[PDB]
Amino acid sequence: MQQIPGKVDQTPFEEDQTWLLHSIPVQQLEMHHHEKDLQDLPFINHEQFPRSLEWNAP
Amino acid sequence: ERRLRILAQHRVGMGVLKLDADKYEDQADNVTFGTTKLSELLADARKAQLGEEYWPSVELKVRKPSGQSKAHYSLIDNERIEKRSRELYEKYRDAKKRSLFVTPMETWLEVKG
Amino acid sequence: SSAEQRIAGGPQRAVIIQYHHQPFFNPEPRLVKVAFQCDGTIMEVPISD
Amino acid sequence: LEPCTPREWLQFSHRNLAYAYNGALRACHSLPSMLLLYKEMKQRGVKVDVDTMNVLLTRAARHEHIQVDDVFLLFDELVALGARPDLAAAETLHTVLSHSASMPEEWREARRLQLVELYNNLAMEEVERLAPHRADRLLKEQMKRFRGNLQQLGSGLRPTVYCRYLHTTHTAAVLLEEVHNFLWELVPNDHPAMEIPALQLRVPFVASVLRRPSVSVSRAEFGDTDVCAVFLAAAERMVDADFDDQRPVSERRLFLSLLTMISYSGVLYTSDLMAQLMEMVKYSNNDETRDSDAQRVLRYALRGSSAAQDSASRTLWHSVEKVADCRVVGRYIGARNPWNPIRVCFDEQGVFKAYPTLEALNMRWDDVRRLIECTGVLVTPPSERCPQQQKMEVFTGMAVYLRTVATGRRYELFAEGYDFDVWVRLFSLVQEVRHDMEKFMADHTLQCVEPEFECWEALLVTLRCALDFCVVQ
Amino acid sequence: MQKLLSPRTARHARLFRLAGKLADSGSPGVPKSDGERLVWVNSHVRRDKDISLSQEEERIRELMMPLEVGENSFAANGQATHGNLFYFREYPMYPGEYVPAEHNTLSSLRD
Amino acid sequence: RATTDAIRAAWEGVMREDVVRLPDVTGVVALYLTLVCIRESGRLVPEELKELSSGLEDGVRPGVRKLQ
Amino acid sequence: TVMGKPLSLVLDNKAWLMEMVLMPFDEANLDYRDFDVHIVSEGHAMPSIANEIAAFALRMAVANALVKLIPLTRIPLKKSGLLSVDRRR
Amino acid sequence: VSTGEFDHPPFQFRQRHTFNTTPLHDANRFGGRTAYLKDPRTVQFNVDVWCAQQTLRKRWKQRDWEVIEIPFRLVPREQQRVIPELYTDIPQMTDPARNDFSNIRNKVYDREELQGVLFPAAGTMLYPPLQRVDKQAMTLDKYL
Amino acid sequence: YDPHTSWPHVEKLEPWVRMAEFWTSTAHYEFRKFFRVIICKLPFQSTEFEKRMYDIRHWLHRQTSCEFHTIYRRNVIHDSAVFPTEHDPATPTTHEHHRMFSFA
Amino acid sequence: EFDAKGREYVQYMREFARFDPRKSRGNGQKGFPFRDAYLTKMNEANQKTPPPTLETIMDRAVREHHQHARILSPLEVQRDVGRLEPIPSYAGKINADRSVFPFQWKTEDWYEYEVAKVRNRRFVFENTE
Amino acid sequence: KSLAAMYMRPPVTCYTDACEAPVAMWDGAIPLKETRKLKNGVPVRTVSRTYSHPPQLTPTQLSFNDINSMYCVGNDELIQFFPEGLGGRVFQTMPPGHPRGFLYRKETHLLNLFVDKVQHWHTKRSVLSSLTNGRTGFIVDGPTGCGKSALMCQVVHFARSRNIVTLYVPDAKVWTHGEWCWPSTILPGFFDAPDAARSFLKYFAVANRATLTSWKLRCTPKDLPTEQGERQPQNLYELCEWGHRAVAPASIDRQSVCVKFLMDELSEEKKLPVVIVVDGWNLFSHETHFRYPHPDFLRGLASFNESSTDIDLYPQELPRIPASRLSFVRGLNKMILSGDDPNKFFITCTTRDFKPFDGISGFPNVETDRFANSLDEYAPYDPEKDSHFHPIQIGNFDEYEYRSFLRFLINSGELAGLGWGPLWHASSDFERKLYKIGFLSGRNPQGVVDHYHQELVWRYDYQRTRQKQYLLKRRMEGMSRGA
Amino acid sequence: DKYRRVPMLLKPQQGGQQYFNHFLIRSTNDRLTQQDVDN
Amino acid sequence: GVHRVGYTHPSTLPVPCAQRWDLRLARARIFQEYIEEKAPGAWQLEDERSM
Ligand SMILES: Nc1nc2c(ncn2[C@@H]2O[C@H](COP(=O)(O)OP(=O)(O)OP(=O)(O)O)[C@@H](O)[C@H]2O)c(=O)[nH]1
Ligand SMILES: [Mg+2]
């Protein structure tokens, strides 16, 4: 990972207790993704055209 | 080639530099956009021909100092540390006549208010 | 040894020793075991050549 | 039936069709009828088994208008196809041959030789099959059957089969019984023999019938080589394995029984068998009998055959293969016990009558050197059967002899109560042996002779004992 | 007293001689020092002694072996509920197994 | 120190093709190539074929499996 | 080796799972040391296959490979039922 | 291969603390971090985040080297080549010519080997020369 | 289906399958659409062949559709004049110049 | 003949036998070698094939020499007790090397192989000379 | 067959012979043979065990011919020579009442002879230097469960039976990965592990009472703090006793002084051969999981909202304290790197008991986790580069060692009465067990032990079923014939 | 039935097929031994 | 391990070489890559479920 030089930063931790006790919120509302939103849900999954999932763009 | 491969992170694979131009709604626009981007990438890559300063550095996973080197961490300032310890034992012995439990913060470690 | 890939030569007369017609015995590119008249050397030549 | 659906394709198989075709062949009643079925078997890809061979051979030999040439040709075609010959088919062909006398004698002898080879192959393969199951009794009975079947043809079971079977044996009773049976099969049933007590067996005299050149001469031309090789196989099997018996039999008794067998057979001995016999007595754990065993075996080795008659053949054999070579003499020096009141060497065909201390040990060592000289094996020219490396056994045996006087034990306190002068003479002996080793190595360096680990270690042990003597002094 | 290194029996000596022959032949995987060769030979003869021990152990256990539901022996194999569910054949299955034909029958056919 | 970067890069460019098809050349140049390659084959072929050999290539490649 | 790792590590050092993989050799009267095998998984990939159904599949694959290597091994294996396929989902 | 649990247990009823079962969301499953816990999808996503955290921490503790960027000239011959970026070409072997078949990307160089290029200003060997044992010397291991 | 035997060759492509489960007591019904790719590799650009290939959709089979993928070699110039190589400026760019909404 | 998987893996092995990273340029997933063999070659621990155990050598030599009965291969022993087949040409002729078979590899190298194979799907230069 | 009643116990001579159990337990597990002798009558019957326990021999009595053989050590000798314990998993096989077995490998013989020379080193100095290539000792490396800990235990046994000063450090994690770390009272910038230090001092003193009692302290202040009634220490044994025998927390600061002076005096000594054996030298080589305290805890604070400190808000990761900064390891390194001390021999071994990680990792369920007490150290280790000792590579058992070890395990467990016993007929024979366990373990020692235990679970062994079927059929047909 | 899907060869799941030949050969050997004892 | 990320100008090194942060900024210029300044160095998680 290339961090902006001169910026104070912390390398990923090596202990389980650090990750456990550190303040990371848990996901509570619905999940959002920058491109899986057009495809509404896993059970809905809107598709544009019936192209093969193996289809390759040249 | 090194500089161009570094600048084209995932755009290069198995010896082929590939660029998917889809910015515009027309393939006639995307051909021009891709041509411009290829020319810019090539021009920036050719900076490696100006001088060595433009040759990208190689990333070598340099090991941490080995155990043999780490051993000398115990011997750095060996004589001075021995002198200090022999001097400090006197202070420890004197302090033991006043407190049941002597403390490094009392002997050498600096814990202030 | 300095060639990045095969080098083709002139078409010489030769005789076929064998030819594995099975795809699993000739993965792409296909090869043919052929013996050349000059020097009697046997080589696996690409089918295209 | 031709398989049409995949369910029948899951059941179709050529080797399994062999079963149905064997059944139809057995059901058939006429050889001419079985011929069409067998022709169709061959036209199809049906794998020809051993049951088809048995059936065709039997129903053909019992057919009337057959020819023995065609019976044997059908057997040849079956074996050329993937058919395994069996004892039953071998017996059928054997009876057919023995009853076929109208054919030319050349053909009859050729087919007799073929059938001899067939019996030998069957015996070999069955020995191999029954080896792992530890079925010594069943294997012995099967070997009885094969031996009886070869007797009619005259030629007996061959020494290679006998050697493998003996190396595979598991108990002394059958090992000795099979050596005995080989000796008796090598001779006619009315041949004279010597009875061996405690075994209730008779060893026949076989050198009377063994082949001899009768006249350069080759070592392989003498038939004694195969018999001595089977004896060597028995000795090797004895050494390299443990027997299990409801009543265990002793090592010394078994070794003496084998010695008596070879002695009464009275066959010319070989360096290999003599050295193998001597190894056991050298490494024997009994002290008050190993000297007697060693002198007995050395007497046998020097005599050559221990045979009463035909002294010219023993001289010829000695000129041929040099019995009692360096390996045997080195093992003899290693086996002979120091301070034993028996003569170490032989004088003018010495029966080793007896000895009349520091001077006693000096006499023993000088007699050992005289024995080495009289055997004169250090002059023998190196050969391909025996390279120079064997010659190191003499120095190894001498070093072990010195070790045995250094310590009162042998492969079982630092040392005993001796004289300081005795230990000085022992140190001198160690030094002179060390230096004769140097002369030997310098002489034969052109093949890079190498000392034995026992030879090197015995000197170290003798020096350790001498040093302990010095320390206690 | 110091124990002597050399082979202590004829079988030991013969195995050491074979090991030396193999080393001279230079087949892969063989050692080159006599001490490790002697270690190899000693371990092999000890293994043979152990194998003979196992043979005698099994032959004694064959006669000590239980066959009735008793103390620490019991038919949890459904023989009481289901019965004899395991097959057991006394004939060699032709292609795989082999047992020599009986000599009474051999002689009968030959005669 | 042998040849300039231009010639070197030209050489890799020539040899880097998918298939390095050899060029057709004039007769005089073909004669020159034949003669110079005859001169050079001696330096490459082993001593046992430096004079007599059943072919110009004989000895150039060691592993060539012949027929007989 | 199952998918590039030793069996004792793939099946998490569980005796009751690896003995199924051994079974085709024993039923065939064969030494497992005379053969070296590699098992590749084309099914649903999972971090750990240390279970009885996966062991069953591995045993069946080994048995089929042994059958095709040496046909006469098919006799004891089919009789033992290592060639038979369960149909349970 | 990993024997740790990756999925969250399903909820089809209220469990109890029994011989073969334990209460859902107890302080035993994921190191006691289930005290933060609804929807199986979001719960599984949180468990996936925790598992990724564990993977990362162990993957970083396994890392004993450092990635100093060295100029091309002051570099070993094996690294004086063109190295494709990750996931761009086939895993590259260091040098098949010298029988070195090993992922070049995973090569690690001992710090007491580049003191000639690192720390060129310090004329004293900050790290003493690496002691290498002699293989061609009779030692206790080679004595038997 | 073999490139070695015929020209052009047909290669298979995985059918697009979309299963849907809905109330009826539930039912599973899936839409399916099967594909086949015809590949023609020519050692030259023939606009006549491109025309005759494009004209296929007019007599395509009933209720069957087609789409065309073209991969052709094209010459591209790198004009070093409009795109030159220059020394890296005296004051180099920092991360502020590549900030959010910096592209505009 | 061969079954589907046998044919598939025979083709894989032939491809790897004629594989070349230089000839695998400008190509998609078809340029990646036979994963298992390639990673086994790359793994260093497999670059050292242990020699036969001292016990194996001792037993083989004892049966070869002290007993005049060579040890036969499992492919060379005759199993059909009623038929005699011809020994295959490959019976005991295939040397055992750990760098060729069986396939052992490092987990990170396998991960990189898989990710690169799935990501270089469309990095193919279809039109070539 | 009931030859059990006819069996009479042999005469007890050693703890191993005392480990024998009632005949009812091992009747059939160890079948009894019968030997007929002709003593004062042609018929006699001596029912004896087919298998006897491996001999209980001293390291002096062990010989070259014993290579790849199993011997035993009496419980009294074990307690005498190992007060600190048996690091690693070696005591896994020695429950109460079990014989304390030990394999004698080629490496074990080499080490025994090397310690024999160390017993009189000053004369054999050239031999020792040639053996170690001049390095100050050996380090033993190899795969997991390979036998490094067992070899170090055997080395300590050899040295302490030969009466040489031995510093045995089992489970070097007790020192590096200890419970809590404390800065050294008298060494500035150096840290302690007081619990491990006090335990080590107790066990070392009790182990080496004789030589330590005969010892005379050379460089040690004799004004050491002392409570009423206790005599000032005059020998190294009394120094260790003063260090480790004290009331808490007065022991925490006393142990640091004791260990510092003990290390100084051991470094000074130049006449007695001192063997230092440590299990897991890589731990003492690279680092300890303890970190340096945050400087806020040292600087001091008045109120929390004043300084805006985040010590109780966010955890951090201070640099890990390297193992070189401990006082015990400081003494060891001082003695190691500093030449002019050909008196101490470091026979160390590495460890590989780290938790596993193979690309992905979830959470190991607590109840089913055989790596619960494994080390969180996934970094690689190379003994040659990470230490000054001469590396010795061990591998898995070869068939000879494996056969001997499994024979001892199974037969002695059953004889002592902890195996199948009356249920021996439920388990396959020794040859099948050997073949299967060899397959399952790859002849790895730890794997062999684990699968010997797991053999309780085998479900695809039909040998005994078929044997019972065949013998029952044979008996039934015999009875039918008899009828 | 609950286990209708499993094969009949797996219902009892016979095992130990490698011992039958050994048992046949040992029975024949013991028969020969008994005959010899009788004689 | 809390730290401050560093940077060496090509001029300062004994032999200059194009730095990786410079290459990163060149890539950002060419491809208009927005670089989030507050991206944490500790939070580098990969979705193992897919990778
Ligand atoms: N009695 C005895 N047990 C041994 C011997 N070698 C290995 N073991 C067994 O192996 C088990 C594991 O101990 P080691 O192999 O020494 O463990 P290690 O060598 O320190 O390797 P790690 O576990 O990775 O630290 C012990 O429980 C022993 O029972 C041996 O020579 N004698
Ligand atoms: Mg350990």
From TrEMBL, chain D:
It comes from the Eukaryota. This is Uncharacterized protein. It comes from Trypanosoma brucei equiperdum.
UniProtKB/TrEMBL annotation, chain E:
It comes from the Eukaryota. Signal peptide: none annotated. This is Ribosomal protein S9/S16. It comes from Trypanosoma brucei equiperdum. The chain holds residues 1 to 111 of 443 of the full protein.
From TrEMBL, chain J:
Transmembrane segments: none annotated. It comes from the Eukaryota. This is LysM domain-containing protein. It comes from Trypanosoma brucei brucei (strain 927/4 GUTat10.1). The gene is Tb05.45E22.300. The chain holds residues 106 to 234 of 817 of the full protein.
UniProtKB/TrEMBL annotation, chain M:
This is Uncharacterized protein. The chain holds residues 11 to 61 of 181 of the full protein.
